[PDB]
Ligand binder design. Sequence first.
Ligand SMILES: CC/C(=C(/c1ccc(/C=C/C(=O)O)cc1)c1ccc2n[nH]cc2c1)c1ccc(F)cc1Cl
Ligand SMILES: CC/C(=C(/c1ccc(/C=C/C(=O)O)cc1)c1ccc2n[nH]cc2c1)c1ccc(F)cc1Cl
Ligand SMILES: [Cl-]
Lengths: 246, 244
Amino acid sequence: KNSLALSLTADQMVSALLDAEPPILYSEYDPTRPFSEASMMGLLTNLADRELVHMINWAKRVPGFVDLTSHDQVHLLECAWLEILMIGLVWRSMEHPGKLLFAPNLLLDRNQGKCVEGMVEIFDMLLATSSRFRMMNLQGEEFVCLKSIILLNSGVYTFLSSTLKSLEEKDHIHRVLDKITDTLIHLMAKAGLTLQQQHQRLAQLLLILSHIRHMSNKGMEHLYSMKCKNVVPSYDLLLEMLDAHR
Amino acid sequence: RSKKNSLALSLTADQMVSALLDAEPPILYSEYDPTRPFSEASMMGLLTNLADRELVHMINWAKRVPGFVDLTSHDQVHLLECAWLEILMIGLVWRSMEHPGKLLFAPNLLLDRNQGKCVEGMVEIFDMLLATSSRFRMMNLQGEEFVCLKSIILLNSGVYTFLSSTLKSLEEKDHIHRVLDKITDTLIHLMAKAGLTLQQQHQRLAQLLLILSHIRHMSNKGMEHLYSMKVVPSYDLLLEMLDA
Ligand SMILES: CC/C(=C(/c1ccc(/C=C/C(=O)O)cc1)c1ccc2n[nH]cc2c1)c1ccc(F)cc1Cl
Ligand SMILES: CC/C(=C(/c1ccc(/C=C/C(=O)O)cc1)c1ccc2n[nH]cc2c1)c1ccc(F)cc1Cl
Ligand SMILES: [Cl-]
């Protein structure tokens, strides 16, 4: 692939990723009205709906992503969307121990998780991830690398791949993933970590992604258990949004 | 802030690998000569039976993973509850590597895709497992890398879901993270000795650890299908096997 992505240095990768970051959105409720009146699930659903649109724009700006066919872009987003929302939430919540910062005007604690049956389980997992990032002193530059890894990794092993084209798409993804790895290592070397510390930190970061997958899976199961499914993107919806984007 | 006294942390890379290779469970056989062809119910029976027998050996293996016995029984159980199906699955994928298009559950139970269709929804899981096996094959995964990955799953999968208020709980967690760091070093060591450059080492490490996310996903899907049909070994069972 002549992909410009593969010619990027670590610093250019980080710049591109920092520049692609979506805005922090606000929850939509009247702050003049008391907080009951508001449905918690309604607020969260609405927020996720609005976050999704921005996620598509962000994805299109991840180096290497637009080199893929639309079909593969959709497949990656279908698999990764909730993991991406979740890693964003955890990062925003880092400086708020015991709380989840859904939006600047929607900072929830554990006991607010108990609104909606089974959500507290997810809340606790999210809190623990936020604690882990805090403990590790996760940097914004590392965060954007991890979020891009999720986009590219989560769906890559579930392409139905008979064709030459599909094999080339997979190879491409793996090369970009290798570039993000290099980028992460670079950031750590420049922060003055030893070689051993670099590889240990890389491993600690990537192992957290396993827990993010777990949380996404649990979350998706609770959502599928519902008789309404207002925002969870079908392939076709995602393809439309990708086409509607351009 | 306190660092648990563990012989595990004094092991070199080479000693870690040896200890892990030595702890490997045996390859078990499926219930000998069943009625073939299989029904949906008979296939599930064979797979359930196999998992039950594999579990006992998994506990023995876990007890021999350096650092694992340093933990309290409660924490050992928590790790196994979270990791058990992922461990079965990574074992299966490794055994299946040299059998393209097939899953080697046991030497007398080698199934292909179309045999996955015998139980409703299972082919989806089969396909994910096959794809993982292909990925390991493509990467030329080595047996020494495999044992490191399998131990990482044991230690990592449940580590973030200890409910941890006390200093003691934080020290247990730190211990786990140090052992995980030791296994990372061990993996890097193996790659360096295989003659990979520094860049290649870090890239390969990342490729391997990213597969663990897919293994978590398969475990989750597997558990969901099983709950839809009917499964996590009970705390008490696990405790007994750990005590026994
Ligand atoms: C953990 C929080 C959460 C989010 C969520 C995602 C989708 C929907 C609804 C989809 C639909 O009807 O199609 C509802 C809530 C959430 C909503 C904003 C978010 N912004 N950043 C992260 C965020 C997560 C949630 C809550 C309950 C649950 F059973 C499962 C989940 Cl995942
Ligand atoms: C994919 C294969 C499979 C395994 C399996 C694991 C546990 C149980 C437990 C049931 C119970 O306790 O009542 C049943 C089946 C399997 C059985 C041996 C195995 N050895 N190595 C890997 C292995 C997997 C399976 C099948 C259908 C499904 F819906 C989900 C799964 Cl996970
Ligand atoms: Cl908005």
